[PDB]
From a paper:
The transient receptor potential channel TRPM7 is a master regulator of the organismal balance of divalent cations that plays an essential role in embryonic development, immune responses, cell mobility, proliferation, and differentiation. TRPM7 represents a master regulator of the cellular balance of divalent cations and mediates uptake of Zn2+, Mg2+ and Ca2+, which is required for the normal prenatal development and healthy adulthood. The TRPM7 structure represents a tetramer assembled of four identical subunits, with the overall architecture reminiscent of other TRPM channels. Each TRPM7 subunit consists of an intracellular N-terminal domain (NTD, residues 1–789), transmembrane domain (TMD, 839–1146), and cytosolic C-terminal domain (CTD, 1157–1230).
To confirm that it is VER binding to the vanilloid-like site that causes inhibition of TRPM7-mediated currents, we tested the ability of VER to trigger the closure of the TRPM7-N1098Q channel, structurally characterized as the open channel in the absence of ligands. First, we conducted functional analysis and confirmed that TRPM7-N1098Q retained sensitivity to VER and NS, albeit the potency of both inhibitors was substantially reduced. Similar to the ligand-free apo condition, the purified TRPM7-N1098Q protein subjected to cryo-EM in the presence of 100 μM VER was represented by a single class of particles. This time, however, the corresponding cryo-EM reconstruction yielded a 2.99-Å resolution structure in the closed state, TRPM7-N1098QVER-Closed, where the pore appeared to have a nearly identical size to the pores of TRPM7Closed and TRPM7VER-closed. Importantly, we found VER in TRPM7-N1098QVER-closed bound to the same vanilloid-like sites as in TRPM7VER-closed, strongly supporting the idea that these are the sites that mediate TRPM7 inhibition by VER. Overall, functional characterization of the mutant TRPM7 channels verifies our VER- and NS-bound structures and supports the idea that the vanilloid-like site serves as the primary inhibitory site in TRPM7.
Residue numbers in the entry:
A (entry chain A): 3 to 540, 614 to 797, 839 to 1147, 1157 to 1230
B (entry chain D): 1099 to 1147, 1157 to 1230
C (entry chain D): 839 to 1006
The structure:
């Protein structure tokens, strides 16, 4: 059948015949005009009932010959005289002519259909989610008329309550009723076109206009906007989405609302609002001016079980007014003030135009309506009575329906709306259960409702109390939220492929992920021997610092808006933000590498650079208060983050703007100094004091007070615990600035000897200089090995991956390996004893030296970049050599575009040779540098250096070369100039930052380097080696200073927020917004006074007269 | 003239990338020394014996839905980018505050009549 | 994917048709360059025959590229394919090489010294100059890159907008 609609649903229709009102009107012979006009009680014209079996009776007049017990018929049984069959009217309305052509959809079923079928196709076939509210508007359906404010404002709520809860407004469909009125609101608001309210509006197929347009299976409908003035049949209202057109099996008749609009309401209220939550979906009944039947329908919902509440409105019309009217008269519900118990019946008369026996009947309905005034409300637009019908609608389900504040809250949680609960659940004198607050936080966290996290943690829910192993452990094991589907990937990696069926994530696992994401040696609390024990055993089952544990959860499961909220709370704010920048930055890298669908990497890279920018912006807010303590923040051992440091995390995340802040540079200077006060002393004195040891005793050092913010090793702390002469040397030699200027002056004494060897002739055996040269390199190489093995990194494969990601550690490797190819072939050779440079082995080993030298002059840029002016220019020559590879290839086509024709045109007898690989590249390269070879152009000329190259075709090379240089000296070499000139600021700005970042890795390498330079370093090696076989820094604070620093961080965080809030509220754009929104409101509250004042005037013009 | 040719030349490049890719997407597999084979195959057989985005009828609808929504947003966003802008809020604010001046001062009049009234009605 | 459908999907990929022509063209320019530089006897060497083969078969690719073009009337097909810097430069380079091969193969060859038949001389200097059309074409290949493309598409807009300084 291919269509689940008609495969399941069916259409009912009359199959027998029952003449409705047999008596013909006129046209003397009845027989034809009778049958031609006299409809069946079925519905339509009797002749129209095709359904062949009836049509073999329509042939004469009907079924059941003429009279033949004319009384007997008169029921039209809607199962026997009425069989059903598969649907042939179900499709999609297009609303022909609609101004962007708002769409909807329809089906056509039999009212005996069971609600299981309507629900399942609604959520499967029509493919929707179960709502979170059902606003079934059982109001009055007579195209009625209102005042603008209530036409306008009342929608401002009704729409808003339904878009904020994904509702399904369930009207009567028809455009001559309650449907007609919500559409007036649905358009005035427009819902900023989206998946807005998914209105259903069930109605029949009997009273419907242009039924024939939308006949056919799964068929688009040319349904047309007929505002024909009379049109007994009615159009469906415009803005309504999905429709149902239940065909009773009869034109004209009513009834195909309640048979389903009853069942649907209950049947949705039978279903669970959400996976986590376990309530019933709420039903709320709204009333626009009702009627004699509605005012009983109102009562029915009051009388249902579950007691579905109702919302009426003062000033839409007859019923909503009267139900609101008696709500004023009746007090307690049970009363009816007897002084006016038919005086309302005086009003019940005038409004409707009722009679008497129904007047008490309406009044009767009014009584049971009031008997529960509890679960029913009124909308008094004329006053300030719970404004904006939203609150009333949303609230009304909570006040009336007896449910605990838990059962209240959990609904508000499902509806992503605190403002209700903030003022209607979290109200004075409330009976808050002991664990309901806790059990709600379980739901708000998993469902990603930060706003309720805020609400609960405000009203009092300590994360310290609500954070056990089992609670936390499953927060990972949930799909009921914006889950990261990548977390399960990182886990199955660190398990080395293992992947059980369901796999309860254990906290061992999350640890091993963070150990893998944060890298290096970051040991989480989740993996330590203590925690491993207690986890295999289950307030000791709690965590000390919860918001350090949830901040990980909020970031692993990619829940940013939760992460930031959980960041501002708690403590260690700078630290947490830099961990997050590492985690996100670390997940992004794993996403790219291990792809399955959309990377979400730029989503994470944006999430890192958000946290990673708070730290920078939190630092400057601390550097501007007390620059000293703000340098202690970057260095204190954290103790909740694996004994790491607020700066070693930034360096781990390659977060250049932090290490390149002016606090991470004034500290690094303060360590570069050491115990020296080099603002008083001068670099002249250090260079002297090195080559003059006893001049160390005239250098002005720093007190232990001036080295509080400066992390130290254990030994320097001891020399400041346990200045004397002996401690006045140790503080010099173990200074980074001294270890530098004590290596430079060695290296600059290495390059002056090596240079001497390279230039001066070299006999069989190395001269005294060349032995010293080998000594440096050898001992220097050892310094480069021990620099690797004793590196911070863990697995050797990672130690052998950071030290080779450095331009100068490769260039050392190439230069230390190469010099020992050189010393090998220089010392290891036969030495002809007649002339050197007749042993190509000897020759070779030298030319290794004379070329390796370039590695060693170029290294002075590692020394020259120490300066704040020279560093950048050194860090630009990388970014200019890189970003011009493509111009320079274009400059090599042109070179061979010219070199091949010229060597072909000028030397036309050349056998194959390697000279044909130089001479097509040689002179055309030296032309770029202004050497024109002017007496070799026009080789046939009289002034030629090449008078033998004159031959056929050699008059062409002056032209080719003219064309050549115009390209290689005017177009292309001045394209470079324009390249550099326009890429200068944006590389100079960076190269400062790449420099200020690399200053970290440089200083903190001398702060672990031997005192003694690479000719004599071998002593300090043997000392450390000999003793390590026989026998980094820390910011040592006292327990009192740990508090003072802790106080510093707290205040500095609090200001960061308090300043930005004012920088936003003080800005003009924001004051225009408020001013605008006030001045809107002002216009309203003035003009209403302007009205009212105009009533107090026309009053007093007539009261006394 | 470097930025304003570099900005263009990107765009002229990204445009010419169309005519380039969509020429290999109709080019023979086999390069211009051996292409003669793929020619003879196509020639011999064409005497003897562009792309399309093949959707299913279901996907034609889902794409049709995609266009519809994306149009509707384009308008709904720009309308707000205009109504949310400051220049526009100054315009309204201005025009309201003009109107406000009027509807206040007329009350200011009227209130001054309800006062001189009650100073004399009961006396 | 099966083995037989796992080849067809490779070879009929545009990126493959590119890197399978580049490595041919870059094997054409390495032979042509060899011919141009090295002396040239009465008959074409194995290299120079392969050189002619590329151009000839390449020319056919340029004809079928026209006739089977999207455009309608031939006068419009012959107006889009000549609005392209490299399809003109091919036309000039395919027409010119066959003036070169014409005067190189079609000549008397003095049998004592080449470069004493100005016909032979001529046909070569056609080769040694046509070559510039074929190195310059690597900018059609080098402009594939997102960094190199622009710099290739600037050398037009700098050569054009400075004609007037260069007359001064
Ligand atoms: C931090 C990581 C980066 C640094 C890496 C550090 C490691 C560096 C890596 C080095 C690897 C490079 C290769 C080894 C060098 C020699 C190669 C060679 O050609 O030898 C030659 C000499 O061979 C001899 O035996 C005679 C000279 C003594 C050898 C001294 C070299 C080894 C020193 C290494 C000290 C390194 C340890 C430094 C301290 C740690 C062999 O040829 P020949 O005999 O001359 O030929 C005679 C031919 N004829 C007879 C025809 C004339
Ligand atoms: C025919 C002649 C042709 C020209 C010949 C060759 C000449 C040219 C040189 C060639 C040397 C080969 C290295 C090229 C550099 C690659 C890297 C780069 O571009 O920059 C990178 C680093 O860059 C560096 O670390 C070094 C930069 C090159 C300096 C060149 C030496 C200058 C002195 C030589 C004096 C010699 C004088 C004596 C000579 C006897 C930075 O790039 P980036 O954009 O920041 O990318 C991010 C980096 N990241 C991944 C680490 C985050
Ligand atoms: C601009 C203002 C300045 C003036 C303008 C005036 C224009 C008037 C020009 C007139 C040119 C014709 C007259 C010369 C021929 C006489 C014979 C002769 O000398 O032959 C010589 C060949 O030399 C040539 O063929 C010279 C180049 C000819 C082309 C000129 C450029 C085209 C115009 C511009 C367009 C360019 C396109 C630009 C592209 C961007 C041979 O003699 P040889 O050299 O001794 O070598 C033989 C030696 N051997 C026998 C031993 C082997
Ligand atoms: C897509 C559109 C753009 C591409 C356009 C493609 C078409 C290309 C357009 C080409 C037009 C250019 C002119 C024709 C070339 C020859 C001219 C010439 O000088 O010939 C010479 C050789 O003539 C001979 O007959 C001997 C050599 C064989 C001729 C081979 C050339 C034709 C190949 C064409 C293949 C093209 C097919 C390509 C596939 C489509 C005549 O002179 P000579 O005999 O040397 O003189 C002797 C003098 N002596 C005796 C004093 C010494
Ligand atoms: C061995 C070797 C011997 C030969 C060596 C000597 C080689 C000499 C070097 C020559 C340089 C070759 C490079 C220039 C290529 C053309 C540039 C181009 O496409 O411009 C424009 C073409 O504009 C048009 O309107 C199309 C038609 C014009 C074609 C120009 C032909 C030049 C012929 C020269 C004959 C030289 C022959 C000389 C030799 C006999 C760009 O496109 P467009 O403007 O957008 O196009 C119009 C489209 N529109 C209307 C929709 C806008
Ligand atoms: C005395 C010497 C004097 C100088 C001599 C000559 C040197 C100078 C070269 C002269 C060649 C003649 C062509 C000039 C270009 C015309 C078109 C142009 O300007 O740009 C147009 C395209 O441009 C192109 O398509 C090509 C641009 C020229 C590239 C030059 C070759 C560089 C390599 C050669 C290496 C050779 C090395 C070996 C040599 C043996 C673009 O212009 P536009 O503004 O975007 O306009 C819109 C275009 N539209 C209509 C298509 C929409
Ligand atoms: C590895 C790092 C070690 C640390 C470095 C220090 C340890 C190195 C210490 C001493 C090394 C030398 C001791 C051995 C004997 C030397 C003999 C000699 O060469 O004499 C020559 C001088 O010396 C030179 O010309 C070369 C050495 C000095 C200049 C180069 C290094 C200076 C820098 C390093 C120091 C300052 C640092 C400045 C920058 C901060 C003189 O003789 P001549 O030139 O042949 O001519 C004589 C005339 N005659 C030939 C006609 C007779
Ligand atoms: C043995 C007898 C004694 C004499 C020997 C020793 C002579 C002197 C040695 C070297 C010459 C330069 C000396 C200047 C130092 C000034 C101090 C200074 O500020 O240094 C700076 C650079 O520190 C460096 O070390 C820069 C690199 C110099 C050593 C490497 C050789 C490069 C120069 C040769 C290349 C070949 C060129 C060839 C030319 C022919 C560091 O401090 P800053 O940048 O000011 O820091 C700013 C912020 N702060 C101040 C707040 C901290
Ligand atoms: C059209 C597209 C074709 C596709 C390409 C593949 C087909 C082309 C395949 C084969 C062609 C050649 C076969 C015929 C016989 C060759 C003999 C010969 O020249 O031997 C020489 C080598 O060869 C050369 O020097 C020229 C060929 C190789 C280099 C140039 C092309 C390489 C690029 C294309 C390939 C890589 C692609 C690279 C780019 C990605 C050696 O001899 P000699 O130099 O004379 O000296 C010998 C010493 N003696 C003289 C003292 C005795
Ligand atoms: C035979 C054995 C095998 C080896 C032989 C073959 C060796 C290699 C062959 C050529 C050398 C260059 C190789 C680099 C390619 C890297 C990949 C790449 O990204 O390519 C790019 C350019 O693609 C091109 O094709 C660029 C042009 C190269 C071919 C033309 C020769 C130019 C070089 C000669 C000039 C004269 C210099 C002369 C110097 C003496 C395309 O991709 P993309 O730009 O990255 O795209 C960005 C976005 N995306 C990645 C998401 C898609
Ligand atoms: N204080 C301080 C300080 C001391 C020394 C240096 C020198 O730089 C050392 C490191 O600087 C690295 N580096 C460099 N080095 C620049 C450079 C190195 C060598 C030469 Cl010959 C030249 Cl032409 C330039 N450029 C980098 C970049 N663009 N991005 C990331 N890292 C870069 C490089 O790995 C090198 O090992 C920088 C700062
Ligand atoms: N992917 C990809 C890709 C591959 C190749 C190309 C090169 O495209 C070449 C086409 O690009 C055209 N073209 C070009 N070509 C640039 C150029 C061509 C040749 C040379 Cl020697 C040089 Cl100095 C520069 N410039 C154009 C311009 N300024 N306006 C319009 N079209 C231009 C030209 O007609 C030529 O036909 C561009 C992109
Ligand atoms: C894309 C670019 C196009 C241009 C180009 O790069 C790529 O193409 C390359 C091909 C190269 C030639 C290939 C083979 C040989 C044979 C050899 O024969 C030794 C013989 C004897 C010596 O006496 C032994 O004993 C001599 C050198 C030569 C001719 C090469 C020269 C350089 C050339 C022309 C290169 C040129 C720069």
């Amino acid at each position: 059948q291919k269509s689940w609609i008609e495969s399941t649903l069916t259409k009912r229709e009359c199959v027998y015949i029952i003449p409705s009102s047999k008596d013909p009107h006129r046209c003397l012979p009845g027989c034809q005009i009778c049958q031609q006009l006299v409809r069946c009680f079925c519905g339509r014209l009797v002749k129209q009932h095709a359904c062949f079996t009836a049509s073999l009776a329509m042939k004469y007049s009907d079924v059941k010959l003429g009279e033949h017990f004319n009384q007997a018929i008169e029921e039209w049984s809607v199962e026997k005289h009425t069989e059903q069959s598969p649907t042939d009217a179900y499709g999609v309305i297009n609303f022909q002519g609609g101004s962007h052509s708002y769409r909807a959809k329809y089906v056509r079923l039999s009212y005996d259909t069971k609600p299981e079928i309507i629900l399942q196709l609604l959520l499967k076939e029509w493919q929707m989610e179960l709502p979170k509210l059902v606003i079934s508007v059982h109001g009055g359906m007579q195209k009625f008329e209102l005042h603008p404010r209530i036409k306008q404002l009342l929608g401002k709520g009704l729409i808003k309550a339904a878009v904020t809860t994904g509702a399904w407004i369930l009207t009567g469909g028809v455009n001559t009723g309650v449907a007609k009125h919500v559409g007036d609101a649905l358009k005035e608001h427009a819902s900023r076109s989206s998946r807005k309210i998914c209105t259903i509006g069930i109605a029949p197929w009997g009273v419907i206009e242009n039924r024939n347009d939308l006949v056919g299976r799964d068929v688009v409908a040319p349904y047309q906007t007929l505002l024909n003035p009379l049109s007994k049949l009615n159009v469906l209202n415009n803005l309504h989405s999905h429709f149902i057109l239940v065909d009773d099996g009869t034109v004209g008749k009513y009834g195909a609302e309640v048979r389903l609009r009853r069942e649907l309401e209950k049947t949705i209220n039978q279903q669970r609002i959400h996976a986590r939550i376990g309530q019933g979906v709420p039903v709320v009944a709204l009333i626009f001016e009702g009627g004699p039947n509605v005012i009983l329908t109102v009562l029915e919902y009051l009388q249902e079980s579950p007691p579905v509440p109702v919302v009426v409105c003062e000033g839409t019309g007859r019923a909503a007014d009267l139900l609101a009217y008696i709500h004023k008269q009746t007090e307690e519900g049970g009363n009816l003030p007897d002084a006016a118990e038919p005086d309302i019946i005086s009003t019940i008369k005038k409004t409707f135009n009722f009679g008497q026996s129904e007047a008490v009947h309406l009044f009767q309905t009014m009584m049971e309506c009031m008997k529960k005034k509890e679960l029913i409300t009124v909308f008094h637009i004329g006053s300030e009575d719970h404004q904006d019908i939203d609150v009333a609608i949303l609230t009304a389900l909570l006040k009336g329906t007896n449910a605990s504040a838990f059962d209240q809250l959990i609904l508000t949680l499902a509806w992503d709306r605190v403002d209700i609960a903030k003022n209607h659940v979290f109200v004075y004198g409330q009976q808050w259960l002991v664990g309901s607050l806790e059990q709600a936080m379980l739901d708000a966290l998993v469902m990603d409702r930060v706003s309720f996290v805020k609400l609960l943690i405000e009203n009092g829910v300590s994360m310290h109390k609500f954070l056990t192993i089992p609670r936390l452990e499953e927060l990972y094991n949930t799909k009921q939220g914006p889950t990261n589907p990548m977390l399960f990937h990182l886990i199955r990696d660190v398990k080395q492929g293992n992947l059980p069926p369901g796999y309860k994530i254990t906290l061992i696992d999350i640890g091993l992920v963070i150990e893998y994401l944060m890298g290096g040696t970051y040991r989480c609390t989740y993996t330590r021997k203590r925690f491993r024990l207690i986890y295999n055993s289950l307030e000791t089952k709690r965590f000390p610092y919860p918001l350090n544990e949830l901040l990980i959860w909020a970031c692993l499961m990619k829940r940013q808006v939760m992460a930031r909220f959980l960041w501002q709370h708690g403590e260690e704010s700078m630290a947490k933000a830099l961990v997050a920048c590492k985690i996100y930055r670390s997940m992004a890298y794993e996403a790219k590498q291990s792809d399955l669908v959309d990377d979400t990497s730029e989503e994470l890279k944006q999430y890192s650079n958000d946290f990673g920018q708070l730290a920078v912006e939190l630092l400057e807010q601390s550097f501007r208060q007390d620059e000293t303590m703000a340098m202690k923040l970057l260095t204190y051992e954290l103790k909740n983050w694996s004994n790491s440091t607020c700066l070693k995390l930034a360096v781990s995340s390659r977060l250049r703007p932090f290490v390149a802040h002016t606090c991470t540079q004034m500290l690094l200077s303060d360590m570069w100094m050491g115990r020296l006060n080099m603002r008083k002393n001068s670099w002249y004195k250090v260079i002297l004091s090195i080559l003059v040891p006893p001049a160390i005793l005239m250098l002005e050092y720093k007190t232990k007070a001036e080295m509080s913010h400066i992390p130290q090793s254990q030994d320097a702390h001891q020399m400041t615990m346990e200045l004397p002469i002996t401690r006045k040397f140790y503080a010099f030699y173990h200074a980074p600035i001294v270890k530098f200027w004590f290596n430079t002056l060695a290296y600059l004494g290495f390059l002056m000897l090596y240079t001497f060897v390279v230039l001066v002739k070299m006999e069989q055996l190395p001269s005294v200089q060349e032995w010293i040269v080998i000594a440096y390199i050898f001992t220097y190489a050892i310094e480069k090995v021990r620099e690797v093995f004793m590196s911070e990194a863990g697995k050797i494969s990672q130690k052998i991956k950071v030290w080779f990601s450095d331009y100068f550690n490769v260039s050392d490797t190439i230069a230390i390996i190469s010099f020992f190819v050189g010393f090998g072939l220089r010392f290891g050779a036969k030495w002809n004893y007649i002339n050197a440079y007749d042993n190509h082995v000897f020759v070779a080993g030298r030319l290794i030296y004379c070329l390796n030298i370039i590695f060693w002059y170029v290294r002075l840029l590692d020394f020259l970049a120490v300066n704040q002016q020279a560093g950048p220019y050194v860090m630009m020559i990388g970014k200019m050599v890189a970003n011009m590879f493509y111009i320079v290839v274009i400059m090599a086509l042109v070179l061979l575009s010219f070199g091949v024709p010229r060597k072909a045109i000028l030397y036309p007898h050349e056998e194959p040779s390697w000279s044909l690989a130089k001479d097509i590249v040689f002179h055309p390269y030296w032309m770029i540098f202004g050497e024109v070879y002017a007496y070799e152009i026009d080789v046939c000329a009289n002034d030629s250096t090449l008078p033998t190259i004159c031959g056929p075709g050699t008059w062409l090379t002056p032209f080719l070369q003219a064309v050549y240089l115009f390209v290689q000296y005017i177009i292309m070499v001045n394209l470079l100039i324009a390249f550099f000139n326009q890429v200068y600021l944006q590389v100079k700005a960076i190269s400062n930052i790449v420099w200020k970042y690399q200053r970290y890795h440089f200083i903190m390498a001398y702060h672990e380097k031997p005192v003694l330079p690479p000719p004599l370093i071998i002593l300090s090696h043997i000392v450390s080696l000999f003793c390590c076989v026989c026998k980094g820094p820390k910011l040592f604070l006292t327990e009192e200073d740990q508090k003072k620093l802790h106080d510093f961080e707290e205040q500095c965080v609090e200001m960061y927020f308090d300043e930005k809030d004012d920088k936003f509220n003080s800005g003009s754009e924001e004051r225009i917004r408020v001013t605008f929104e006030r001045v809107e409101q002002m216009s309203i509250q003035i003009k209403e006074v302007g009205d009212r004042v105009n009533y107090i005037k026309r009053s007093l013009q007539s009261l006394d007269s």
